[PDB]
Amino acid sequence: FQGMTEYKLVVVGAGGVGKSALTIQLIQNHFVDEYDPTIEDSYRKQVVIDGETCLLDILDTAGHEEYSAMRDQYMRTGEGFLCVFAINNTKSFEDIHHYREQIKRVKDSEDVPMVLVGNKCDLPSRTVDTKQAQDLARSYGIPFIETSAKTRQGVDDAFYTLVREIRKHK
Ligand SMILES: Nc1nc2c(ncn2[C@@H]2O[C@H](COP(=O)(O)OP(=O)(O)NP(=O)(O)O)[C@@H](O)[C@H]2O)c(=O)[nH]1
Ligand SMILES: COc1cccc(-c2ccc(Nc3ccc(C[NH+](C)C)cc3)cc2)c1
Ligand SMILES: [Mg+2]
């Protein structure tokens, strides 16, 4: 034993869905109200999940990004993916399929650890129904979690569930 197990997590999804808010809420217990678009940021947190101490290495991605070769590099290194949309933005939900395809393509695999995340569940302007999202997740064979970076609902659960998925995969 040389140190706690390490997991490489990538947070992906359309611009504005709250990928950064979720990550910052996890790491710093802080909600960011301001919208500062991200290019690429890396974070690290030690947690205990199901009695195993482990180290989450988290890559926060950009939503607004085209073809890049830098992009495909970290999808190759990443062991698990949080695919985030916002429950008040139907476009970000439809984009989920595109994110999953990019991942499946680069990892050259049908069975990649993933979790579907419906963020901003605190907002009253919901446009994507929970049942719809559960059905999408059921069809992909992956878990679905509703989160709010603001209230903190589901945040820990989302990351911990992803880790549990990576564990099952090996
Ligand atoms: N009400 C509410 N607002 C949220 C939530 N998550 C993020 N936001 C808000 O939505 C905006 C976008 O959040 P942000 O984390 O920057 O989104 P992002 O996916 O990281 N954007 P980008 O892809 O450009 O980096 C911020 O103003 C933030 O306050 C949430 O769960 N609830
Ligand atoms: C290539 O694809 C990946 C994919 C996903 C995550 C990672 C990853 C994330 C964070 C770290 N670690 C890290 C290093 C420095 C700091 C900054 N320190 C001040 C804490 C934070 C995290 C390392 C790798 C790499
Ligand atoms: Mg971001």
Residue numbers in the entry: -2 to 167
Sentences from the paper on this structure:
The RAS family of oncogenic proteins is important as therapy targets because of the frequency of activating mutations in almost all major cancers. All family members function by signal transduction to the nucleus of cells via interaction with effectors (such as RAF, RALGDS, and PI3K) that catalyze phosphorylation of downstream proteins. When KRAS is bound to GDP, the protein is in the inactive state and becomes activated by nucleotide exchange from GDP to GTP. Mutant RAS proteins remain in the active state and hydrolyze GTP at a much slower rate than wild-type (WT) RAS.
We used these analyses to design of cross-over compounds linking the common diphenyl-anchoring moiety of PPIN-1 and PPIN-2 to the Abd-7 aniline fragment. All three compounds showed very similar binding modes to Abd-7 with van der Waals contacts to K5, L6, V7, S39, Y40, R41, D54, I55, L56, G70, Y71, T74, and G75. Ch-1 was found in four of the six KRAS169Q61H chains (A, B, C, and F); Ch-2 was again found in three of the six chains (A, B, and C) and Ch-3 was found in four of the six chains (A, B, C, and D). Thus, by combining the anchor constituent of the PPIN compounds with the aniline fragment of Abd-7, we generated a compound series showing good electron density for the entire molecule when bound to KRAS pocket 1. While the interaction of the high-affinity WT iDAb with RAS was minimally affected, even at the highest dose of compound (i.e., 20 μM), both the lower-affinity–dematured iDAb and CRAF binding to RAS were progressively impaired, starting at the lowest dose of 5 μM. Phosphorylation of AKT (downstream of RAS-PI3K signaling) or phosphorylation of ERK (downstream of RAS-RAF signaling) was determined following EGF stimulation. The PPIN-2 (and control Abd-2) had no effect on the levels of phospho-AKT or phospho-ERK even at 20 μM (addressed using Western blotting), but we found that the three cross-over compounds caused loss of phospho-AKT or phospho-ERK, as did the previously described compound Abd-7. The potency of the two of the cross-over compounds (Ch-1 and Ch-3) is improved, relative to Abd-7, as these show IC50 at 72 h of 5.3 and 4.5 μM, respectively. Structural comparison of the six chains in the asymmetric unit show that compound binding has a minimal effect on the conformation of the switch regions in RAS protein.
